Amino acid sequence: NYDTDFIFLDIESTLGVVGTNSDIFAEQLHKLSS
Amino acid sequence: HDADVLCLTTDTDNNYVFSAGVDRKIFQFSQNTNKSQKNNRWVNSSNRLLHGNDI
Amino acid sequence: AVKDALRLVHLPSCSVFSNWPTSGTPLGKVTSVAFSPSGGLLAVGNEQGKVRLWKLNHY
Amino acid sequence: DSPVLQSAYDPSGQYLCYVTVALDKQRVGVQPTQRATWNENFLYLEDSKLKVTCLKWVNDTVAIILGMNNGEIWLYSVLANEVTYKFTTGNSYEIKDIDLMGNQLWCIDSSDAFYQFDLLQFKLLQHFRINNCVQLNKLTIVPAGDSVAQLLVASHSISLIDIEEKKVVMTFPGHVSPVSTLQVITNEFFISGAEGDRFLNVYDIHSGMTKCVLVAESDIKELSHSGQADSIAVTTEDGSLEIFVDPLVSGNKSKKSSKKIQIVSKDGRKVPIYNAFINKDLLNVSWLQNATMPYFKNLQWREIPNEYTVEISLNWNNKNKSADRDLHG
Amino acid sequence: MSLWQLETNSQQFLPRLNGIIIDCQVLGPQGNYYSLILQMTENNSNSDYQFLLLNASDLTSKLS
Amino acid sequence: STARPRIITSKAPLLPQQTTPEQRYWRQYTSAQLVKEHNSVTHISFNPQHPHDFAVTSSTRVQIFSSRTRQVIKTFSRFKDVVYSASFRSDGKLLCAGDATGLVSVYDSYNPRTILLSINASTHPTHVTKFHTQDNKILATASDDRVTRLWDISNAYEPQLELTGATDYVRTLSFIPAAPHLVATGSYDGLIRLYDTRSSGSTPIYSLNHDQPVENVIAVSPTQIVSCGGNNFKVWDLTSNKKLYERGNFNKAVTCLDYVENFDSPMQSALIASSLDGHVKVFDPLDNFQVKFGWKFSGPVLSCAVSPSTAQGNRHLVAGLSSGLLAIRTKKKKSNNFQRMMRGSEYQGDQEHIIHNDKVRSQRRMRAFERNINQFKWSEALDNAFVPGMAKELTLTVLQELRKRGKVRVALYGRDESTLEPLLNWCLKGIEDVRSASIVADWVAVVLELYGNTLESSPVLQELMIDLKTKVRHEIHKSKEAQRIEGMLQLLT
Amino acid sequence: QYKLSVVSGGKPALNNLSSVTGNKNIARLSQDQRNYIIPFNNQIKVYSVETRQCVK
Amino acid sequence: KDANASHPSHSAIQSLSFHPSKPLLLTGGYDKTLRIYHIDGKTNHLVTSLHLVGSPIQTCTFYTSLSNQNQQNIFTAGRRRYMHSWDLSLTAKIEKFSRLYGHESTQRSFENFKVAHLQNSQTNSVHGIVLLQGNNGWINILHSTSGLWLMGCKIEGVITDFCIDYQPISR
RNA sequence: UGCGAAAGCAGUGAAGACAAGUGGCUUGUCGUUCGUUAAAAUGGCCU
């Protein structure tokens, strides 16, 4: 592949490469609006 | 059927209805299963091509 | 079919309301209608494309 | 006209409590102003003829006080969705304004009566009324530490009130229309602005002289001043935001706006800002994207130009591309 | 992929699935998706399976 | 899932002298009307501005034909010798006609009764008269006095310039289309002389040496002119003063030329030329003036024209022969209550936020063979193949789809004597052509492999097989002797 | 300085056992059926049904 | 105030329906676009607006289920052989039901449809049905989330209208 | 099956079990094993 690496394909077809109160209220409101 | 249904009959206890016409096949409709009976549902059970031209 | 053809009847009594619609309520050629499920609120849409909105103050 | 009746940021400016009408019943919603840190569940009012006049945040489970129009302040916890308590004045007049300092809550009435409740005791301490102030619709508690001296009411004409003597100690020439905003700016100045005018005026609370007169270019709807009086961001009637930069320094008597922000869509459609919020170096503007859902934007206002316009992505003819389908259908 | 209406025995067909069907089952609570497995028998050098669900509404492949 | 892909028609490799798009466009100029004039049709020009009329010069009458009905609308008869030239002004408001007595009569177009003025030019026959293309009040008349003239049509007593300097029988004018001072005249001694009019005018500024006597000279671009005379036309860059193309693809002398630009055509610009031998030919000045199409008429074609670049209607090609006749070829171009009820069907959603669009674009209608193949009726696909008026590549493509897709024997099971005769009746003609002969081969192979006993029983197809054998013998004789000619071409390597 | 790695995936690897027709599919939908959890021989891809992208 | 006084319609208003919970109004007509309006008295403002090309809607209906009250579909139909279900969650995700599962002879348009609830009654699972009015006497009832044909009720004569009655049984 | 070109050149069994027909016999089969490099149930494709 054209950026100085070489890619290979396995036989189980895996491609590989060789290369170089506030936060409490906030959490409770986001949990109540969930 | 694929075309007209010229003649059709039933059995004694009305658990089967057989039917046939100009597309030379006989269809059998069944109501034997007790769920089909208590729900009063017929099913297109089977189909036989045994004739030559019509019935 | 005709202009301003809408009536509100009151049931059980089945007696049509006499004070609305009057001759100057802009119903138009009433072609669809829907009551709102909560506020007591008619919405009547006519042939020229105008949903007019009334609020039934009893609710 | 805009579908949102009431809106107020909390202090720290991270939640906006906004009261709208939803098919002849008003409802109170609370939205977080930056999600990176939609809320679906409101508090509906029950009657069609009961309606929220004024609203204020308390700072300590966080809650709102909604001054209603039947003479009751509803204290409403936002983390539940029920009203915690209903403070009731003895009468049925709509209450025009509330303000709190600590655990002490003051409300004005439309019978021109002043009521003091203790939010810790849940009781009405003091009920009184003062001569020659008779169409009040705003009060502010001048912060004097733990002491809750010096109310400041406005009736088209501001007047400063000693409460332990129950009298008017100074009177200020206000406007010609009823006052709509009345806010304390430092511990000696206050800004005031009226219904349907574009002239704010800041008064000295010790002498009475108008220091300065701030001129927006459209009718002022709401304002929010920064925490140290170096900025005042007014949201106007045409839906623009105008930032007066350091409005208390030496444009000698009447000052125009320093920065002016508006929002347009990709179409050209100007969407209007309601109720923005300024602080140090960071400004939070807000608008309504669909019919009644608030959207927000945090703008670093110190480095944007004078005349600024956000260009937001709002649908106008966008061809509906389902994600399960390429362009040729 | 045929689906048989078992009352009156009526099939609805989905005819060109670019792989033979070796598993099909309905998936959702109200049966909105159908999960299918296509075995793609053109190359006999390998058994390569395309997994496919699709929604029953318009029978478009949601997430192949 | 997928849409079922169409049945592809069977396109075999292409053959020489195929249809280029340029000759397709030119070949659809049809319905050639002939008009018998009385004498040789010397000149023909077009209206420029609303270019919808053309003036044809027969002898002693000029006929304005119209390009909506191709008949004479107006006629000019009141000449006193043979009329030679007829041209419309650049605006189309008036018409000049040069005569064989040297009397350039200018009428107004679309009114033959008002002779606007009459220039008494030189005593010899004036032969070419045309207005300036850029200016609108000078008129160039050249005669058999070897001098062209630029008259001003206000002062029609003395010419505003008198372009002398020629040696034999000036017959053609042109003007250079950007520089309006530059007059390119052409005479019977080659020598396309051209003049700057600011100077004296008795001396051309340079002379372009056509060899043969020129018969016409037009200007194509602002910078290159085309002069025709003798068997060839030669194109000349004016700036480089240089001949840079030449075509001599005619038998007799090129009589006349004209040129169209940026009209609705695959050929962006076109130079058509008329050459005394029946042939009028079109050359494409973009791919080095190559010929692209041509017509042949029943005599010496003496003048030709085509309807100009902004014709906007019925597009005409006229050629007037010296035989006395003329050929024209053209290419042609509930209630208010109910509507108020059913109003909004024309909307298409301008102010609407989202727009959905899933309506499938309705494709071409499937033919009988294609829908029978798609329903897997293969014998019926063959029956639908062998209908009478069916295209030959369509019969070939359904034979190919049956052969490749399935099994020819499956398509050929239930046959007998009357239902096999259409197949072999087509196979007789289809064993000729090279695109079809291999498919006809293995089709007839399996049909004799399946129906051997009917060749015993039915005698209706025995002689069909015999005549098939004769046609196979014919084409194998040709398919061996073509190999012989291929060998005796290989020897000549 | 040349090192070998593997980056990209392969086959989704259903139950390649005999005698089990029908449910030879391992892949599941979530309860709030927004994402489709399908194994491979190499990774457990969770696709998202709303946007057709592998999300994690 | 007139509910579509904000954004005017470009045709007659053939169908009009309020949302069951939210303060929304859906309007639709033969200009093949359907508009939702958050209504109140003061400013009835346009929430959104979808223009389904070439499919002029006759009947449109807000539908929410009894299972979670978080479906919020919009079903629209007109004189075409398909129906649209716009899934609401505030691009748009719409599905097009065009398969009558073998019963296409007895349903030539989807115009007169209604939406109703139905229980499985071997489980206690509700879902939604859409009931189309067909040609002969037919009411073709089909599932709302999967589009499958469930049953069909034929009457004698010429079918003109129908409705849905619910009656409780137990918890 | 091997080798090769797209042509072609070399090379092709035994057990176990079951059924049928006449404990035996005979044939055929195998979601049984070892070795050799070794056609059919009226049943066809969406809007």
Coordinates of C-alpha atoms in Angstrom, one line a residue, chain F residues 121-434:
Chain F
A121 CA -22.8 50.8 -60.4
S122 CA -20.2 50.0 -63.2
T123 CA -21.4 49.2 -66.7
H124 CA -20.4 45.5 -66.6
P125 CA -22.5 43.1 -64.6
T126 CA -22.2 43.5 -60.9
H127 CA -22.0 40.0 -59.5
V128 CA -21.6 40.2 -55.8
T129 CA -23.4 42.6 -53.4
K130 CA -23.5 42.5 -49.7
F131 CA -23.8 44.9 -46.8
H132 CA -21.1 45.1 -44.1
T133 CA -21.5 42.6 -41.3
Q134 CA -20.4 45.0 -38.6
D135 CA -21.5 48.3 -40.1
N136 CA -25.0 48.7 -41.4
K137 CA -24.7 51.5 -43.9
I138 CA -22.0 50.5 -46.4
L139 CA -22.6 48.1 -49.2
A140 CA -19.9 46.2 -51.1
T141 CA -20.6 45.6 -54.8
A142 CA -18.1 43.9 -57.0
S143 CA -18.6 43.7 -60.8
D144 CA -16.9 42.5 -64.0
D145 CA -14.9 45.7 -63.9
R146 CA -12.2 44.2 -61.6
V147 CA -13.1 46.7 -58.9
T148 CA -15.2 46.2 -55.8
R149 CA -16.9 49.2 -54.2
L150 CA -18.0 50.3 -50.7
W151 CA -21.0 52.5 -51.2
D152 CA -22.6 54.4 -48.4
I153 CA -26.4 53.9 -48.8
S154 CA -27.0 57.5 -47.9
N155 CA -24.7 58.8 -50.7
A156 CA -25.5 56.4 -53.5
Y157 CA -23.9 58.5 -56.2
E158 CA -20.3 58.0 -55.5
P159 CA -18.6 55.2 -53.6
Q160 CA -17.1 55.8 -50.2
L161 CA -14.2 53.5 -51.2
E162 CA -13.3 52.0 -54.6
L163 CA -11.2 48.9 -54.0
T164 CA -9.2 48.5 -57.2
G165 CA -6.0 46.5 -57.7
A166 CA -7.4 43.3 -59.3
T167 CA -6.5 41.7 -62.6
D168 CA -9.4 39.4 -63.5
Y169 CA -13.1 39.2 -62.7
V170 CA -13.7 39.8 -59.0
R171 CA -16.6 37.5 -57.9
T172 CA -16.4 37.3 -54.1
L173 CA -16.5 39.6 -51.1
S174 CA -16.2 38.9 -47.4
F175 CA -15.5 41.1 -44.4
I176 CA -13.3 40.1 -41.4
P177 CA -15.7 39.5 -38.5
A178 CA -13.9 41.3 -35.7
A179 CA -11.9 44.0 -37.5
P180 CA -14.5 45.9 -39.5
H181 CA -12.0 47.7 -41.7
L182 CA -10.8 44.6 -43.5
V183 CA -12.3 43.5 -46.8
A184 CA -11.3 40.1 -48.2
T185 CA -12.1 40.1 -51.9
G186 CA -11.5 37.2 -54.3
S187 CA -11.1 37.0 -58.0
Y188 CA -10.5 34.7 -60.9
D189 CA -6.7 34.8 -60.6
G190 CA -6.4 33.1 -57.3
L191 CA -5.2 36.0 -55.1
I192 CA -7.5 36.6 -52.2
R193 CA -6.7 40.2 -51.9
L194 CA -7.6 42.0 -48.7
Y195 CA -7.8 45.6 -47.9
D196 CA -7.6 47.9 -44.9
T197 CA -10.1 50.6 -45.6
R198 CA -8.4 53.3 -43.6
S199 CA -5.6 53.3 -46.2
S200 CA -5.7 54.3 -49.9
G201 CA -7.6 51.2 -51.0
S202 CA -6.1 50.8 -54.4
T203 CA -3.5 48.4 -53.0
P204 CA -4.3 45.4 -50.9
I205 CA -2.3 45.0 -47.7
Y206 CA -1.5 41.4 -48.4
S207 CA -2.5 38.8 -51.0
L208 CA -3.2 35.2 -50.3
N209 CA -2.1 33.0 -53.2
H210 CA -4.8 30.6 -54.0
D211 CA -3.6 28.9 -57.2
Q212 CA -6.8 28.2 -59.0
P213 CA -9.5 30.9 -59.7
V214 CA -11.4 31.4 -56.5
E215 CA -15.2 31.0 -56.5
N216 CA -15.9 32.0 -52.9
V217 CA -14.2 33.3 -49.9
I218 CA -15.7 33.4 -46.4
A219 CA -14.3 34.1 -43.0
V220 CA -14.7 31.6 -40.2
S221 CA -13.1 33.0 -37.1
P222 CA -11.9 36.6 -36.7
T223 CA -8.4 35.2 -37.7
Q224 CA -8.9 32.6 -40.4
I225 CA -10.7 32.7 -43.8
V226 CA -11.6 29.9 -46.2
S227 CA -11.3 30.4 -49.9
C228 CA -12.6 27.9 -52.4
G229 CA -11.9 27.7 -56.1
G230 CA -10.6 24.9 -58.3
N231 CA -10.9 21.4 -56.8
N232 CA -9.8 22.5 -53.3
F233 CA -10.5 25.0 -50.6
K234 CA -7.6 26.4 -48.7
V235 CA -7.8 28.0 -45.3
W236 CA -5.7 30.9 -44.4
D237 CA -4.6 32.4 -41.2
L238 CA -4.7 36.2 -41.7
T239 CA -2.2 37.1 -39.0
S240 CA 0.4 34.5 -39.9
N241 CA -0.6 35.1 -43.6
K242 CA -0.4 31.4 -44.1
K243 CA -2.3 28.6 -45.6
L244 CA -2.8 25.9 -43.0
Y245 CA -5.4 23.5 -44.3
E246 CA -6.6 22.4 -47.6
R247 CA -9.2 19.9 -48.8
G248 CA -9.6 18.7 -52.3
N249 CA -12.1 15.9 -51.7
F250 CA -14.4 16.8 -54.6
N251 CA -14.4 16.0 -58.3
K252 CA -15.3 19.3 -59.9
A253 CA -14.8 22.9 -58.8
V254 CA -16.0 24.1 -55.4
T255 CA -18.7 26.7 -56.1
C256 CA -19.7 28.0 -52.7
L257 CA -19.1 27.9 -48.9
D258 CA -20.7 28.8 -45.7
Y259 CA -20.2 28.2 -42.0
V260 CA -22.3 27.9 -38.9
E261 CA -21.2 28.3 -35.3
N262 CA -22.4 27.1 -31.9
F263 CA -25.8 26.0 -33.2
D264 CA -27.4 23.0 -31.5
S265 CA -25.2 20.2 -32.9
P266 CA -22.6 17.7 -31.8
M267 CA -20.3 19.3 -34.3
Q268 CA -19.6 22.7 -32.6
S269 CA -19.0 24.5 -35.9
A270 CA -19.5 23.4 -39.4
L271 CA -18.2 24.5 -42.9
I272 CA -20.3 23.1 -45.7
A273 CA -19.1 23.4 -49.3
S274 CA -20.8 22.9 -52.7
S275 CA -18.8 21.7 -55.6
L276 CA -20.4 21.4 -59.0
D277 CA -20.6 17.6 -59.0
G278 CA -23.7 16.8 -57.1
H279 CA -21.9 16.7 -53.8
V280 CA -22.2 19.1 -50.9
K281 CA -20.1 18.2 -48.0
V282 CA -19.7 19.3 -44.4
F283 CA -16.3 19.7 -42.7
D284 CA -15.6 20.1 -39.0
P285 CA -13.2 23.0 -38.4
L286 CA -12.3 21.7 -35.0
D287 CA -10.8 18.3 -35.8
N288 CA -8.7 19.7 -38.7
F289 CA -11.5 20.3 -41.2
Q290 CA -12.3 16.6 -41.8
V291 CA -15.3 15.7 -43.8
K292 CA -18.2 14.3 -41.8
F293 CA -21.3 14.0 -44.0
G294 CA -22.4 14.8 -47.6
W295 CA -25.4 14.9 -49.9
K296 CA -25.6 14.3 -53.6
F297 CA -28.1 16.0 -55.9
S298 CA -29.1 15.6 -59.5
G299 CA -26.8 18.1 -61.2
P300 CA -24.0 20.6 -60.7
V301 CA -24.7 22.1 -57.3
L302 CA -24.1 25.8 -57.8
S303 CA -24.9 27.4 -54.5
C304 CA -25.6 26.2 -51.0
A305 CA -26.6 27.6 -47.5
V306 CA -27.9 26.5 -44.1
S307 CA -30.1 28.3 -41.7
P308 CA -28.0 30.4 -39.3
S309 CA -26.8 30.0 -35.8
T310 CA -29.8 31.4 -34.1
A311 CA -32.6 30.0 -36.3
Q312 CA -34.5 28.8 -33.2
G313 CA -37.0 26.9 -35.4
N314 CA -37.1 24.7 -38.4
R315 CA -33.5 24.1 -39.4
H316 CA -32.9 24.2 -43.2
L317 CA -30.3 23.2 -45.7
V318 CA -30.8 24.5 -49.2
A319 CA -28.7 23.7 -52.3
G320 CA -29.6 25.4 -55.7
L321 CA -28.3 23.5 -58.7
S322 CA -27.3 24.9 -62.1
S323 CA -29.9 22.7 -63.7
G324 CA -32.6 25.1 -62.7
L325 CA -33.9 23.5 -59.5
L326 CA -33.5 23.6 -55.8
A327 CA -33.4 21.1 -52.9
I328 CA -34.4 21.9 -49.3
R329 CA -33.8 19.4 -46.5
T330 CA -35.0 20.2 -43.0
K331 CA -34.8 19.0 -39.4
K332 CA -38.0 19.7 -37.5
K333 CA -38.4 20.5 -33.8
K334 CA -61.5 20.7 -15.1
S335 CA -63.3 23.6 -13.3
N336 CA -62.5 26.2 -10.7
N337 CA -64.6 24.4 -8.1
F338 CA -62.8 21.1 -8.7
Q339 CA -59.3 22.8 -8.8
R340 CA -60.0 24.7 -5.6
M341 CA -61.0 21.4 -4.0
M342 CA -58.1 19.5 -5.4
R343 CA -55.7 22.4 -5.1
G344 CA -52.3 21.6 -3.7
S345 CA -51.0 18.8 -6.1
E346 CA -48.4 21.1 -7.7
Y347 CA -46.6 22.1 -4.6
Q348 CA -43.2 20.2 -4.3
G349 CA -42.4 21.8 -1.0
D350 CA -40.5 25.0 -1.0
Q351 CA -41.0 26.2 2.5
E352 CA -41.0 22.7 4.1
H353 CA -38.3 21.7 6.5
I354 CA -37.7 18.1 5.5
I355 CA -38.4 16.7 2.1
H356 CA -38.8 13.0 1.6
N357 CA -38.4 11.4 -1.9
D358 CA -38.8 7.7 -2.3
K359 CA -41.0 7.5 -5.4
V360 CA -39.1 5.1 -7.7
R361 CA -38.5 6.4 -11.2
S362 CA -40.5 4.2 -13.6
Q363 CA -38.2 2.3 -15.9
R364 CA -38.6 1.0 -19.4
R365 CA -41.4 -1.4 -20.2
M366 CA -40.1 -5.0 -20.3
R367 CA -40.7 -6.8 -23.6
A368 CA -42.3 -10.2 -24.0
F369 CA -39.1 -12.2 -24.1
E370 CA -37.7 -10.4 -21.1
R371 CA -40.8 -10.8 -18.9
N372 CA -41.1 -14.5 -19.9
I373 CA -37.5 -15.1 -18.9
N374 CA -38.2 -13.2 -15.6
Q375 CA -41.2 -15.5 -14.9
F376 CA -39.2 -18.5 -16.1
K377 CA -41.4 -19.4 -19.0
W378 CA -38.6 -20.5 -21.4
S379 CA -40.6 -22.2 -24.1
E380 CA -42.8 -19.1 -24.1
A381 CA -39.7 -17.0 -24.3
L382 CA -38.8 -18.8 -27.5
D383 CA -42.3 -18.5 -28.9
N384 CA -42.1 -14.7 -28.1
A385 CA -38.6 -14.7 -29.8
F386 CA -39.9 -16.0 -33.1
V387 CA -42.7 -13.4 -33.8
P388 CA -42.5 -11.7 -37.2
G389 CA -41.4 -8.1 -36.7
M390 CA -38.8 -8.7 -34.0
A391 CA -35.4 -7.2 -34.1
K392 CA -32.6 -9.5 -35.0
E393 CA -30.4 -8.6 -32.1
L394 CA -33.4 -9.1 -29.9
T395 CA -33.9 -12.7 -31.2
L396 CA -30.2 -13.2 -30.7
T397 CA -30.2 -11.9 -27.2
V398 CA -33.0 -14.1 -26.1
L399 CA -31.2 -17.1 -27.7
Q400 CA -28.1 -16.1 -25.7
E401 CA -30.0 -15.6 -22.5
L402 CA -31.7 -19.0 -22.8
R403 CA -28.4 -20.7 -23.7
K404 CA -26.3 -19.1 -21.0
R405 CA -29.0 -18.8 -18.3
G406 CA -30.6 -22.2 -18.5
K407 CA -30.8 -25.1 -20.8
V408 CA -31.8 -25.1 -24.4
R409 CA -33.3 -28.6 -24.2
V410 CA -35.5 -27.4 -21.3
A411 CA -36.6 -24.6 -23.6
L412 CA -37.1 -27.1 -26.4
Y413 CA -39.0 -30.0 -24.8
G414 CA -42.6 -29.9 -25.9
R415 CA -42.1 -29.3 -29.7
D416 CA -43.5 -30.8 -32.8
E417 CA -43.6 -30.1 -36.6
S418 CA -45.4 -26.8 -36.6
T419 CA -43.8 -25.4 -33.4
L420 CA -40.2 -26.2 -34.6
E421 CA -40.6 -24.5 -38.0
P422 CA -40.2 -20.9 -36.6
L423 CA -36.9 -21.8 -35.0
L424 CA -35.4 -23.4 -38.0
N425 CA -37.0 -20.8 -40.3
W426 CA -35.1 -18.2 -38.4
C427 CA -32.0 -20.4 -38.3
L428 CA -31.8 -20.3 -42.1
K429 CA -31.3 -16.5 -42.1
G430 CA -29.3 -16.6 -38.8
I431 CA -26.7 -19.0 -40.0
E432 CA -25.5 -16.3 -42.4
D433 CA -24.3 -13.6 -40.1
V434 CA -21.2 -14.0 -38.1

